[PDB]
């Protein structure tokens, strides 16, 4: 079947969190807000990816 859509900003935050603990926080590779790079908790992005994979 067709794979569930995932935005490229989410793919990068997912790729940046590989081999890292879910509580680790990394900088987004594309998002910038209030003059700073948006920080992404690794537990949230992996959860956002897995919730889309289960819909496939």
């Amino acid at each position: 079947s067709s794979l569930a859509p995932i935005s490229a900003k989410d793919m990068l935050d997912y790729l940046a969190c590989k081999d890292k603990k879910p509580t680790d926080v990394v900088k987004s590779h594309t998002e910038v807000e209030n003059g700073k790079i948006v920080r992404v908790k690794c537990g949230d992005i992996v959860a956002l990816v897995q919730k889309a994979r289960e819909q496939s």
Binding site: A4, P5, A8, M11, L12, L15, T30
Partner: protein, 503 residues
């Protein structure tokens, strides 16, 4: 059996590898190759377009017929004699070709690096003997004009007005069954797990099918313009696009310049990116020190090649070089295709990623190779996200109907194309405000700039995804999309106050 043909090809042809003979395997390939259900013919939209004069050479199996003049009959030698003054270079190029000097291959000693051509010469004869084209002990003397253009190893008369044909891929496959099966194997190896692309695509085996199955290619009236696309999509029909006629030099096809005419442009600048890379510039500086005549398997050892080429990087798979160039494809040049980015972390892509590292570890280290390939994947996604943010702005206007002339002057595309937002048809057809400036700008942002960004990442040209191509133009597209969107919002707010004063 052909050891360079994957299992998926025999499985799709309902053949057993052990017992399949060169004649039996060839007949099964031609059946699917010339089947209109598998891409042959004028395609599903053949009722909307008609061929032109040059089209008989682009798709010979569908449109070609021999010329009415001259009305002469000729033997084998009569082709060389009459055409020695009608097509003088064609005869002189054929004379130096290996096809006319087969005894020059048999007398080559085992120490000369070109001894591998003798094994293929015997294999070529091996494929013909199974088909009953020559005696089991009779040797092939030459490959003349009557062989390719009429019938392989013909000994009798041929009519120039009835029996002349354009040598298509199957005509080349009668003798070169190995290379023809490797290219046709692309229909079976290039299968996407989530259906991102049609099965067997993108590939040289279905480039003509993809060309004629493009809605805008059949719908647009400019047939001479659309046939220009066909000239880059003739690998399916003929096999002289890398080793050209009539020299048919294998050393020529290994050079990077053979891929330049097709794999170059605003939507896939592989030639521009590779040449400007360190890999390509080294190929331009050291092409006089390399032996291009040796095969790709011996190019790094017996050829003295120290920089990678298009044939070396793309025709290699797990240490073997075949005419299948799809077994390592992951991104397929267009990162915006749905499912391509989401599949880059799958085991299907990771297996092909390891196959690419195996190609680079022939020179670099596995740590260095994977260090840059990770940059290629993440760098491509960084560009993809830049387009997705700009496309959300233009797509919002499309659903809101606020695009320029969207509701006033937006004519329908030519049949059988349906009107849409950011469709490929708008790249080669335009009328009125269809497409709009914002609609075309964001379309090209992905179709052209984002693609050239990934190409620059895949072919180590730093400017190819930073300043010159990719991130540079995508930044400009993002800025101008934001600028026009804010301008049109201000214009809408200004027009809203005018409607208030009139109501």
């Amino acid at each position: 059996d052909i050891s360079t043909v994957p299992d998926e090809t025999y499985d799709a042809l309902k053949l057993d590898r052990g017992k399949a003979t060169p004649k039996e395997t060839y007949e099964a390939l031609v059946k699917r190759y010339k089947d209109p259900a598998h891409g042959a013919g004028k395609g599903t939209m053949g009722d909307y377009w008609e061929p032109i004069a040059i089209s008989i050479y682009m798709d010979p199996n569908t449109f070609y017929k021999p010329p009415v003049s001259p009305k002469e009959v000729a033997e084998r030698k009569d082709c060389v004699e009459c055409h020695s003054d009608e097509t003088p270079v064609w005869v002189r190029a054929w004379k130096r070709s290996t096809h006319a000097n087969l005894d020059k291959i048999r007398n080559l000693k085992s120490d000369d690096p070109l001894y591998y051509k003798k094994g293929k010469l015997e294999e070529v004869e091996n494929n013909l003997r199974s088909m009953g084209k020559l005696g089991e002990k009779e040797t092939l003397k030459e490959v003349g004009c009557i062989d390719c253009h009429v019938d392989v190893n013909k000994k009798d008369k041929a009519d120039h007005t009835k029996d002349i044909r354009m040598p298509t891929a199957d005509t080349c496959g009668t003798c070169h069954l190995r290379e023809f099966a490797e290219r046709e194997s692309e229909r079976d190896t290039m299968v996407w797990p989530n259906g991102q692309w049609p099965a067997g695509r993108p590939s040289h085996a279905l480039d003509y099918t993809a060309n004629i199955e493009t809605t805008v290619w059949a719908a647009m009236p400019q047939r001479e313009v659309a046939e220009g696309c066909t000239m880059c999509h003739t690998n399916q029909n003929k096999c002289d696009n890398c080793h050209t006629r009539h020299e048919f030099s294998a050393a020529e096809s290994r050079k990077p310049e053979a891929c330049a005419t097709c794999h170059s442009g605003v939507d896939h600048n592989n030639w521009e990116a590779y040449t400007m890379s360190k890999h390509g510039k080294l190929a331009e500086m050291n092409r006089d020190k390399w032996n291009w005549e040796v095969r790709l398997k011996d190019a790094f050892s017996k050829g003295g090649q120290n920089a990678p080429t298009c044939a070396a990087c793309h025709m290699e798979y797990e240490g073997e070089y075949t005419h299948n160039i799809t077994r390592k494809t992951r991104w397929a040049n267009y990162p915006f295709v749905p499912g391509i980015a989401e599949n880059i972390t799958s085991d299907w892509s990771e297996a092909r990623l390891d196959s690419w590292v195996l190609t680079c570890t022939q020179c670099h280290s596995e740590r260095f190779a994977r260090s840059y390939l990770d940059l290629m994947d993440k760098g491509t996604l960084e560009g993809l996200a830049k387009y997705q943010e700009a496309n959300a702005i233009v797509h919002k206007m499309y659903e809101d109907g606020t695009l320029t002339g969207q509701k006033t002057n937006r004519p329908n595309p030519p049949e059988p194309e349906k009107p849409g937002f950011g469709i490929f048809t708008q790249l080669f057809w335009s009328k009125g405000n269809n497409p709009a400036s914002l609609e075309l700008k964001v379309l090209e942002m992905a179709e052209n700039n984002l693609a050239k960004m990934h190409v620059g990442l895949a072919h180590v040209n730093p400017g190819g995804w930073t300043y010159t191509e990719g991130w540079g133009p995508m930044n400009r597209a993002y800025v101008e999309i934001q600028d026009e969107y804010t301008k049109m919002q201000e214009l809408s707010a200004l027009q809203a106050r005018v409607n208030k004063l009139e109501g």
